[PDB]
Design a protein around this ligand. Structure first.
Ligand SMILES: [Zn+2]
Ligand SMILES: [Zn+2]
Lengths: 51, 46, 65, 343, 103
């Protein structure tokens, strides 16, 4: 689901993922840290640029 | 007189009488704690 | 183990501001602006919330259940 | 001149680079030559005033002018300790299976403020652990955590898996004694904040207990203190010895609080002036600027006390200040009665 | 049994007295010291705490002439009570008219 959201949009909201997947906060954080970085006032951004 | 204990992983109420080898049904675990007392206890908020 | 109800120095009620604080961390808020939004002006309550470790759920993972 | 120095000594508290000066109250009869500092009730009643500047729920701010440091400190200390309130003292525990220890749980429960009005109760007598309708309150806390019968297959979050896994203070239910149900309308007696996290549970664990609350003063224990923070500060009065203009005026605006010094273009050039000296906190950053050290004179008005009273929600802070003043009056009356009995 | 007088010595001189006040602390001690020091007939007024463990204070009053040093004590208590009443009235008026102008 996280990867599909990243395909759909470059920015992913952590709270939305937590709500949709019903998963705990730390598991969502582990999912995001593998492929995303925190950008303040914008959420989580994909770590690599569009190639 | 029903003496009741709680095993460490089943957490099920087991009634065992005196001089019984400590075990539990639906397990084999052998740490058998005692349930909390029913007597009222008064505590001070200090 | 768990968040203290009162701030140690001043005495402001800080126990009820813990989980909401986590929500602000579940949101995009930084630590400082989340503390500001919670209304902790003096730095003692900010130290209370910022330096607290939530060991209660880790201990509950070892609870009998 | 000498008269100006005497007036500054007896009216102002100056903050130097390394230390404060003129901190002691000195207006006493015989202390000064050209001044009659003997007590005058009429003069004090003329000069004294109270001005409320900000007041919402659980927060009050007001300036008192004409009072001295001793009386202001007495009011602050009475508010901090000598104002009686309602708080939990006794905890009777029936089958506490929670991870939180019984003594820790009781200590946490004691710190929870209670919205009951303390004036309507009396101090419980020495002993008398049973308590009567007049001088106690009872709160029932019974939370049994169990698995949610309907949940998702994964349900990683404890909220979906479990119910009553967080024992909030809203689970506390008031148990009326005697005729307290008639005297107090429903909803008046309750925990103040309604959201304080008391403990955390897992299925199977249960917390069943009763709480006896009795009247008490903050001097006995800090859980009885009504005010979160009751403090006072002397009103600052920043003065400019010489007119500061140019970019150095902007430097002045950056040395102090953002809202105290304002720069204006009277003739197209920026000149600084004191706008709101109240907003200053005296970070004393003007002393870092070598040039600007000798152009300002930071000071506090001796007889101008801004009181900030942030309460815990037991009752509105204005009633708290009234109760503090009445407690000081009661102490004075008690000692006058003792003196009369002696003579 | 709360406030007890103690004269300067066995001679029982009324010029120098010590009032021991029970279950009291720096609040009343300091306020009363301020209110009684303003009396012109008091040479020396001063309170101290015997020990932080026990809740009692010792006020000492030494007058100039032949005052019994109990009259300044009663006068200071009365002045403090009157001041407290006046500040209570003024604060209530300020709160009330602040509320009225708010609405
Ligand atoms: Zn078993
Ligand atoms: Zn604090």
């Amino acid at each position: 689901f996280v990867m599909w959201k990243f395909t759909q949009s470059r920015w992913v909201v952590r709270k939305e993922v937590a709500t949709v997947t019903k998963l705990c906060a730390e598991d969502v954080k582990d999912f995001l840290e593998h492929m995303a970085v925190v950008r303040i006032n914008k959420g989580w951004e994909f770590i690599l640029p569009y190639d | 007189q029903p003496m009741i204990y709680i095993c460490g992983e089943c957490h099920t109420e087991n009634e065992i009488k005196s001089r019984d080898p400590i075990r539990c049904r639906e397990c084999g675990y052998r740490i058998m704690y005692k349930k909390r007392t029913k007597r009222l206890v008064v505590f001070d908020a200090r | 183990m768990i968040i203290p109800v009162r701030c140690f120095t001043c005495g402001k009620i800080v126990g009820n501001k813990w989980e909401a604080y986590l929500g602000l961390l579940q949101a995009e808020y930084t630590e400082g602006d989340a503390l500001d939004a919670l209304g902790l002006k003096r730095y003692c309550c900010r130290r209370m919330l910022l330096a607290h470790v939530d060991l209660i759920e880790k201990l509950l993972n070892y609870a009998p259940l | 001149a000498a008269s100006q120095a005497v007036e500054e000594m007896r009216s102002r508290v100056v903050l130097g680079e390394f230390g404060v000066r003129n901190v002691h109250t000195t207006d006493f009869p015989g202390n000064y030559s050209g001044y009659d500092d003997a007590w005058d009730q009429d003069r004090f009643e003329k000069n004294f005033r109270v001005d409320v500047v900000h007041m919402d729920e659980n927060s009050l701010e007001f300036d008192m002018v004409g009072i001295d440091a001793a009386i202001a400190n007495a009011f602050r200390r009475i508010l901090l300790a000598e104002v009686p309130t309602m708080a939990v003292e006794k905890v009777l525990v029936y089958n506490n299976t929670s991870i939180v220890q019984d003594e820790i749980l009781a200590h946490r429960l004691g710190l929870i403020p209670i919205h009951a009005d303390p004036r309507l109760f009396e101090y419980r007598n020495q002993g008398d652990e049973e308590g009567t309708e007049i001088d106690t309150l009872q709160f029932r806390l019974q939370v049994r955590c169990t698995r949610n019968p309907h949940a998702a297959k994964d349900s990683s979050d404890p909220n979906e898996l479990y119910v009553n896994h967080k024992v909030y203070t809203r689970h506390m239910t008031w148990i009326p004694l005697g005729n307290q149900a008639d005297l107090f309308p429903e909803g008046t007696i309750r925990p103040v904040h309604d959201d304080i996290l008391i403990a955390q549970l897992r299925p199977g664990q249960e917390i069943d207990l009763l709480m006896h609350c009795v009247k008490g003063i903050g001097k006995d224990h800090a859980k009885f203190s009504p005010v979160a923070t009751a403090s006072y500060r002397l009103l600052p009065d920043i003065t400019l010895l010489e007119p500061v203009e140019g970019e150095a005026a902007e430097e002045l605006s950056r040395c102090f609080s953002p809202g105290v010094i304002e720069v204006q273009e009277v003739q197209g050039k920026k000149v600084a002036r004191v706008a709101n000296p109240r907003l200053d906190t005296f970070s004393r950053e003007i002393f870092r600027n070598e040039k600007l050290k000798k152009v300002v004179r930071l000071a506090r008005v001796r007889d101008h006390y801004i009181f900030s009273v942030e309460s815990t929600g037991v009752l509105p802070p204005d009633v708290l200040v009234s109760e503090a003043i009445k407690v000081l009056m009661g102490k004075c009356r008690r000692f006058l009665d003792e003196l009369d009995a002696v003579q | 049994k709360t406030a007890l007088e103690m004269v300067q010595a066995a001679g029982t001189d009324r010029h120098c007295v010590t009032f021991v006040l029970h279950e009291e602390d720096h609040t009343l001690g300091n306020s009363l010291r301020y209110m009684i020091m303003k009396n012109p007939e008091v040479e020396f007024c001063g309170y101290t705490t015997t020990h932080p463990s026990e809740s009692k204070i010792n006020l000492r009053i030494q007058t100039r002439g032949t005052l019994p040093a109990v009259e300044p004590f009663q006068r200071g208590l009365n002045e403090l009570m009157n001041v407290c009443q006046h500040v209570l009235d003024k604060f209530e008026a300020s709160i009330k008219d602040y509320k009225d102008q708010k609405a």
